Design a protein around this ligand. Structure first.
Ligand SMILES: CC1=CC(=O)CC(C)(C)[C@@]1(O)/C=C/C(C)=C\C(=O)O
Ligand SMILES: [Mg+2]
Ligand SMILES: [Mg+2]
Lengths: 157, 301
């Protein structure tokens, strides 16, 4: 997670402990064509072709949110170090040049195999907002994403 | 029998997440919540034993899905009806009472109970269910109107609105729970929350309202606490308009009331139904691409 934002950008990170093996948590996150497996905001996702670096997916999010759609490109997928990186290239949201890095690491939680998930991001600060407003907004969504990933991963154990 | 009409459409939105309820004779209101025991004992009548029929009208604007709004349509009137029946028995052994405080109390606990059922924190019904109704990011507004022959009791939660036409003038019976409202803003920031201008003022930059049923992730910033108002009826009362923001985003209270008096002057009632259908199709002409749900209740005899 070597993120270092310019002056017109902001950056932060969130973490979450999952009581599930790494291979189980990784099997959900790594499926770039179906983020709705664990993301509670995604209603529909379309992605053409084979999953590879440069693959682009189109996401439609449910109502109640500031945006309705997003276009995202897969920038990195390491099936050995468990690294996933995604960059937002389009949509109707206010997260321009958003780039995120998600990593999964093994650990022992309550005497059983567990998982630590870390997700950091860099994004432009939209006009009319501050770095801590933007960070607060993105952190709220990411914690909701990771909490749903934890509950889905822990129902598969 | 009540006099009402209900119109609802998906509109230009992709799917339908609005819900509406209209239950005639859903409960009997304890008259101890509208008159003191002393007031009726002076005429020999027992306030504990009197029965007054009431009807429930409700509009539920869901977000993140339609399941919380659909649940409110089926459960709110059932939970409130059972609460009013049990409250009517408990005011038999209790002396004088603060009627509007008990009105706030019975509606707050009713909304909190449906919220607790939605979140899976309590069990619900022959089969019992205990897991949450839906995901952490689904919620719904709730504007509810208890209508009887003498009073109109209003409970509001969210950015839906109910407006009363009295004297050929609209009177708003509910204040929208927008997060930039100065009491709602102060309340949210008091507990460490943020109200962020992000395509409109939003709780945490996310939800465009400060109160709703469900949305358990955004707690304790978004609460299901309703604002209750008791409104005695009068002859000047023309009609009641319950509607989601699909109408109030393009039609003002005065424009809605004027249109909802001329269609009426000219099972549901065809007159009130014509006002609801016209108000709904007025919102579709004024540049509204959201779901539209309008309930028009006629208050003249
Ligand atoms: C939930 C939602 C709301 C928005 O305002 C922007 C966007 C549509 C991109 C988003 O899908 C954002 C998702 C984020 C921040 C992270 C993710 O999902 O990994
Ligand atoms: Mg809606
Ligand atoms: Mg709406």
């Amino acid at each position: 997670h070597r993120h270092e934002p310019r002056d017109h950008q902001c950056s932060s990170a969130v973490a979450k402990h999952i009581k599930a093996p790494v291979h189980l948590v990784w099997s959900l996150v790594r499926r770039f064509d179906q983020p709705q497996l664990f993301k509670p905001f995604v209603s529909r996702c379309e992605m053409k072709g084979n999953i590879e670096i440069g693959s682009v997916r189109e996401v439609n999010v449910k109502s109640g949110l500031p945006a309705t759609r997003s276009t995202e490109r897969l920038e990195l997928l390491d099936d050995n170090e468990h690294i996933l990186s995604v960059r937002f290239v389009g949509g109707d949201h206010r997260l321009k040049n958003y780039s995120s890095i998600l990593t999964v690491h093994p650990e022992v939680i309550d005497g059983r195999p567990g998982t630590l998930v870390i997700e950091s991001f860099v994004v432009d600060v939209p006009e009319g907002n501050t770095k801590d407003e933007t960070c607060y907004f993105v952190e709220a969504l990411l914690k909701c994403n990771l909490k749903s990933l934890a509950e889905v991963s822990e129902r598969l154990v | 029998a009540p006099v009402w009409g209900c119109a609802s459409t998906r509109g230009r939105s992709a799917e339908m997440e609005d819900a509406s309820a209209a239950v005639p004779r859903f409960a009997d209101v304890p008259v101890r919540l509208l008159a003191s025991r002393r007031d009726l004992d002076a005429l020999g009548l027992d306030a504990d034993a009197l029965r007054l029929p009431a009807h429930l009208f409700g509009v539920f604007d869901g977000h993140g899905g339609a399941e919380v709004a659909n649940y409110c349509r089926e459960r709110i009137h059932v939970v409130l009806s059972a609460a009013l029946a049990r409250l009517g028995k408990n005011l038999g052994e209790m002396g004088e009472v603060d009627m509007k405080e008990h009105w706030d109390d019975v509606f707050t606990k009713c909304f909190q109970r449906v919220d607790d059922e939605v979140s899976g924190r309590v069990t619900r019904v022959g089969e019992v269910r205990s897991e949450p109704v839906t995901a952490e990011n689904v919620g719904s507004t709730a504007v509810v109107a208890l209508v009887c022959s003498s009073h109109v009791v209003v409970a509001n939660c969210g950015d839906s609105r109910i407006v009363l036409c009295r004297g050929k003038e609209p009177v708003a019976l509910s204040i929208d729970h927008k997060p930039d409202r100065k009491d709602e803003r102060a309340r949210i920031e008091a507990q460490g929350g943020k109200v962020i201008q992000w395509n409109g003022y939003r709780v945490s930059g996310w939800l465009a309202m400060s109160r709703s049923i469900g949305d358990r992730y955004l707690k304790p910033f978004v609460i299901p606490k309703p604002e209750v108002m008791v409104v005695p009826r009068a002859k000047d009362d023309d009609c009641l308009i319950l509607a989601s923001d699909g109408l109030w985003d393009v039609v003002s209270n005065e424009e809605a009331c004027k249109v909802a008096r001329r269609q009426i002057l000219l099972s549901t009632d065809p007159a009130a139904q014509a006002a609801a259908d016209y108000l709904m199709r007025l919102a579709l002409k004024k540049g509204s691409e959201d779901n539209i749900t309008v309930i028009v209740v006629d208050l003249k005899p």
